[PDB]
Amino acid sequence: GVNEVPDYHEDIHTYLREMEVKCKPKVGYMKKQPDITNSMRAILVDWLVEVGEEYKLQNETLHLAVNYIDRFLSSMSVLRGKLQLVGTAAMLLASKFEEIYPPEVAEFVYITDDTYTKKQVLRMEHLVLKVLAFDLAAPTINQFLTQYFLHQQPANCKVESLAMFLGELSLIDADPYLKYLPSVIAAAAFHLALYTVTGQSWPESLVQKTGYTLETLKPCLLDLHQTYLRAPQHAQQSIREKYKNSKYHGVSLLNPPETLNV
Amino acid sequence: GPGSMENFQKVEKIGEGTYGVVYKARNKLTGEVVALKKIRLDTETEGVPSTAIREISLLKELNHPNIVKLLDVIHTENKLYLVFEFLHQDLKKFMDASALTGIPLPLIKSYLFQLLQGLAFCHSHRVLHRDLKPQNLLINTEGAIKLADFGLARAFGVPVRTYTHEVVTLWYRAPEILLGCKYYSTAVDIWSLGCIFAEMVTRRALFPGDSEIDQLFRIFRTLGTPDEVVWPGVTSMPDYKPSFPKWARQDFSKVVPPLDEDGRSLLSQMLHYDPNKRISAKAALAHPFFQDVTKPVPHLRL
């Protein structure tokens, strides 16, 4: 029905595809950051995962914030001591954009254990807005996932939750996910979830919609599959912990498949 | 962000919105007449308001001849100016001051046709407006009419998730919102435009309620109280009550007596109870009511 906007979903999909290209971070920016590393960023994103669950924010909000952070670090060098300030300002902006009831600024100051002041958070807010030129309506993995979900026959909540989980995992690791567009990670995530839970594969109907096939997805799929296999070992655990919850159907407790068979 | 405030000359105050003052102004270098929306941030202790963040980010993407154009954003450390294209009037003022003998049908067709174009463009770009009313529709001297005030707008996902409740100015608010729907979509903007269509014909609000329940009651008296047949789901909705009076639907030719058959057909489809059956902006553009609109499409702004 109209909550799935039949008259607009295809226009909207096409527009999101165009925008993810415009909103894409620079793949190799971390090498150009003298003082920060993939691991420091992984630490930051995992902390933002916790902030989201502490404040019951939307997953969408979390995805926007990461988008903002990675675009900002594409043009602005940041000392390790200031990375968390960028991330805090990013989460604030994402909350103001996406949340019905965004947390107040004082709560964002509070979660940084008074490392930064309210004036610092608000000046970083301004700078991020300047750097992004207020282009905050970025496509995320989640915007693609929810559309792809409409192609399940029939809907399956374990599939949906597992895809969301795998998509979130990818936010942690700039190498190698910076290489992939949201729409592609979403595709890989959806296929991997569907295969894991039901044995089924990337539907032809989504080939029609997206133009992507298992061939085009294969590289991403191989990375996500490794990420899923290694996830109990990864230094950052906040997403697995979050997805143990019944709200997400306990999906982080599911067993990954040993192989994908092509 | 190529602008700076030194190149503008304030001409006069033209309004006051959610951040405060709007001025008409003139670019001293190019001659261009603009509207400056000022947003003071020193009075803000929560930083840049979310209304402004949404308005700016969403309007940057919406380039359409029937959407008021955001030309620039001047971001000082203490103030935020939005530069917009200038339009001399809004539909409410036009209706009050000039449409005493009425708005001629040709002009109503043209205006509604352009509004649907603007709205379809929004929906096609995953944007809900959520405050369509005559005050927020600007008209120029050339006969264009354009969606304005995106302070209440929202970027949606597909399918929609739960958003802020009780949006839309009351008289223009859809029944699914009034009944506390978990989910609302593009159909809420269509409902508003339907209200606006009726209002252009009569010069009075279709459903002028003084309360949420009064508003529902007014709607029910005109369109009949909805049941499971006209609107599957209705009686299960969070704020549906079985105690609701059961009013008979009236012949639609009584709702807006001077409207012709094509007009009534289109109006009825805009005000369908079921959000799922209500017409989309896209499909409305093909309605026979528009068969005779000739007014040439406004050109896009730079």
Name the strands in the sheet holding B8-16, side by side, starting at the edge strand that comes first in the sequence: B8-16, B21-27, B33-40, B79-85, B70-75
Verify whether the Cβ–Cβ distance B124 to A11 is below 8 Å: yes
Residues B263 and B118 in one domain: yes
B215 annotated to a ligand binding site: no
Residues B171 and B63 in one domain: no
- Distance of alpha carbon A67 from alpha carbon A104, whole angstroms: 21
Determine contact, residues B103/B137, Cβ cutoff 8 Å: no
The number of domains in chain B is 2
Determine contact, residues B124/A8, Cβ cutoff 8 Å: yes
Verify whether the Cβ–Cβ distance A3 to B126 is below 8 Å: no
* Cα distances (Å, whole numbers) of residue A152 to A9, A145, A193, A205, B106: 16, 11, 12, 10, 47
Q: Is B113 helix (H, G, I), strand (E, B) or coil?
A: helix
Cα dihedral A225, A227, A229, A235, rounded to 10, equals: 180
Task: List chain A residues with CB under 8 Å of B183.
Answer: 3
**Residue whose pair of structure tokens reads 């450390």 in the numeric block:** B77
Contact with chain B for residue A46, Cβ under 8 A: no
Verify whether the Cβ–Cβ distance B185 to A3 is below 8 Å: yes
Token reading at A158: 């374990």
B290 annotated to a ligand binding site: no
**Burial of residue B5, with CB atoms counted within 10 A of its CB: 0-12 exposed, 13-18 middle, 19 or more buried:** middle
Token reading at B193: 């435009």
Domains and CATH numbers, chain A: 11-24+138-262 (1.10.472.10), 25-137 (1.10.472.10)
Residues B136 and B220 in one domain: yes
Verify whether the Cβ–Cβ distance B186 to A4 is below 8 Å: no
Determine contact, residues B136/B149, Cβ cutoff 8 Å: yes
Cα dihedral A113, A114, A117, A121, rounded to 10, equals: 0
Token reading at B284: 């409305």
- Distance of alpha carbon B103 from alpha carbon B201, whole angstroms: 7
Determine contact, residues B82/B56, Cβ cutoff 8 Å: yes
**Burial of residue B264, with CB atoms counted within 10 A of its CB: 0-12 exposed, 13-18 middle, 19 or more buried:** middle
Verify whether the Cβ–Cβ distance A134 to B77 is below 8 Å: no
Give residues with Cβ within 8 angstroms of A4, minimum separation 6.
Answer: A150, B158, B159
The dihedral built from the CA positions of residue B183, B185, B191 and B193, taken in this order, carries a sign that is positive
DSSP class of residue B299 equals P
- Distance of alpha carbon A38 from alpha carbon A44, whole angstroms: 10
- Distance of alpha carbon B70 from alpha carbon B302, whole angstroms: 10
φ/ψ of residue B81, rounded to 5: -105, 125
DSSP letters of B155-219?
E--SS-----TT-S-GGG--HHHHTT-S---THHHHHHHHHHHHHHHHSS-SS--SSHHHHHHHH
φ/ψ of residue B71, rounded to 5: -90, -30
Determine contact, residues B197/B185, Cβ cutoff 8 Å: no
Which helix (H) or strand (E) element contains residue B92?
Answer: helix B91-97
Residues B106 and B225 in one domain: yes
- Distance of alpha carbon A87 from alpha carbon A76, whole angstroms: 13
| Neighbouring-strand partners of residue B70 | B84
DSSP class of residue B67 equals B
> How many CA within 13 A on the CB side of residue B269?
16
Residues B124 and B137 in one domain: yes
DSSP letters of B239-278?
T--TTS--PPPPPHHHHSTT--HHHHHHHHHHT-SSTTTS
CA proximity to B185, closest of A68, A125, A23, A5:
A5
Q: Is B27 helix (H, G, I), strand (E, B) or coil?
A: strand
- Count CB atoms within 10 A of the CB of residue B22: 18
End-to-end CA distance of chain B: 14
Verify whether the Cβ–Cβ distance B186 to A105 is below 8 Å: no
* Cα distances (Å, whole numbers) of residue A228 to A26, A52, A189, A258, B259: 25, 22, 10, 10, 62
CA proximity to A73, closest of A58, A59, A60, A85:
A85
B297 annotated to a ligand binding site: no
Q: Is A138 helix (H, G, I), strand (E, B) or coil?
A: coil
- Count CB atoms within 10 A of the CB of residue A145: 25
Task: List chain A residues with CB under 8 Å of B46.
Answer: 104-105
Residues B145 and B178 in one domain: yes
Structural domain ending residue among the three candidates B71, B88, B105: B88
Q: Is A108 helix (H, G, I), strand (E, B) or coil?
A: helix
Residues B25 and B96 in one domain: no
| Neighbouring-strand partners of residue B16 | B21
Calculate how close chain B gets to A235, using CA atoms only, in Å.
32
Contact with chain A for residue B43, Cβ under 8 A: no
CA proximity to B254, closest of B290, B229, B277, B223:
B223
Token reading at B39: 């947003």
Task: List chain A residues with CB under 8 Å of B159.
Answer: 3-5, 146, 150
Q: Is A141 helix (H, G, I), strand (E, B) or coil?
A: helix
Determine contact, residues B123/B281, Cβ cutoff 8 Å: yes
**Residue whose pair of structure tokens reads 């300002």 in the numeric block:** A89
Structural domain ending residue among the three candidates B37, B57, B88: B88
- Distance of alpha carbon B81 from alpha carbon B92, whole angstroms: 25
- Distance of alpha carbon A210 from alpha carbon A169, whole angstroms: 23
Determine contact, residues A209/A11, Cβ cutoff 8 Å: no
Determine contact, residues A77/A31, Cβ cutoff 8 Å: no
Which residue from B minimizes the CA distance to A96?
B50
**Residue whose pair of structure tokens reads 């100015």 in the numeric block:** B169
Residues B148 and B249 in one domain: yes
- Distance of alpha carbon B35 from alpha carbon B8, whole angstroms: 10
Continuous H helices in A99-181: 105-111, 118-132, 141-149, 157-170, 174-177
- Distance of alpha carbon A66 from alpha carbon A64, whole angstroms: 5
Calculate how close chain B gets to A187, using CA atoms only, in Å.
16
- Count CB atoms within 10 A of the CB of residue A175: 14
Continuous H helices in chain A: 9-22, 29-32, 38-54, 59-75, 80-98, 105-111, 118-132, 141-149, 157-170, 174-177, 182-198, 204-210, 214-230, 238-242
Asked if the peptide bond before residue A176 counts as cis, ω within 30 degrees of 0, the response is yes
Give residues with Cβ within 8 angstroms of B142, minimum separation 6.
Answer: B298
Calculate how close chain B gets to A69, using CA atoms only, in Å.
17
**How determined?**
X-ray
Q: Which domain holds residue B245?
A: 89-299
B17 annotated to a ligand binding site: yes
Catalytic residue ranges of B = 131
Determine contact, residues B74/B81, Cβ cutoff 8 Å: yes
- Distance of alpha carbon B21 from alpha carbon B15, whole angstroms: 6
B90 annotated to a ligand binding site: yes
Which helix (H) or strand (E) element contains residue B281?
Answer: helix B281-284
Calculate how close chain A gets to B97, using CA atoms only, in Å.
37
Residues B137 and B212 in one domain: yes
φ/ψ of residue A163, rounded to 5: -55, -45
Give residues with Cβ within 8 angstroms of A45, minimum separation 6.
Answer: A66, A69, A87, A171, A172, A236
- Distance of alpha carbon A164 from alpha carbon A173, whole angstroms: 16
Contact with chain B for residue A122, Cβ under 8 A: yes
B134 annotated to a ligand binding site: yes
Structural domain ending residue among the three candidates B88, B109, B124: B88
Verify whether the Cβ–Cβ distance B126 to A96 is below 8 Å: no
Residues B43 and B167 in one domain: no
* Residues constituting chain A: 262
Token reading at A191: 């296929």
**Residue whose pair of structure tokens reads 């979830």 in the numeric block:** A193
Contact with chain A for residue B276, Cβ under 8 A: yes
User: What CATH number did the domain enclosing B125 receive?
Assistant: 1.10.510.10
DSSP class of residue A258 equals S
Q: Is A111 helix (H, G, I), strand (E, B) or coil?
A: helix
| Neighbouring-strand partners of residue B13 | B23
Token reading at B139: 């008209």
Q: What single letter denotes the amino acid at residue B200? A: M
Residues B204 and B240 in one domain: yes
What resolution in angstroms, rounded to 1 decimal?
2.2
Q: What single letter denotes the amino acid at residue B41? A: L
Q: What helix, strand, coil percent values describe chain B, rounded to 5?
A: 35, 15, 50
Which residue from B minimizes the CA distance to A124?
B47
Task: List chain B residues with CB under 8 Å of A5.
Answer: 123, 156, 158-160, 185-186
Cα dihedral B258, B259, B261, B266, rounded to 10, equals: -170
- Distance of alpha carbon A62 from alpha carbon A85, whole angstroms: 16
**Residue whose pair of structure tokens reads 């608010």 in the numeric block:** B173
Angle at B257 between CA B255 and CA B261, to 5 degrees: 95
φ/ψ of residue B31, rounded to 5: 90, -10
- How many Cβ contacts (< 8 angstroms) between chains A and B? 106
Residues B147 and B12 in one domain: no
Verify whether the Cβ–Cβ distance A102 to B50 is below 8 Å: yes
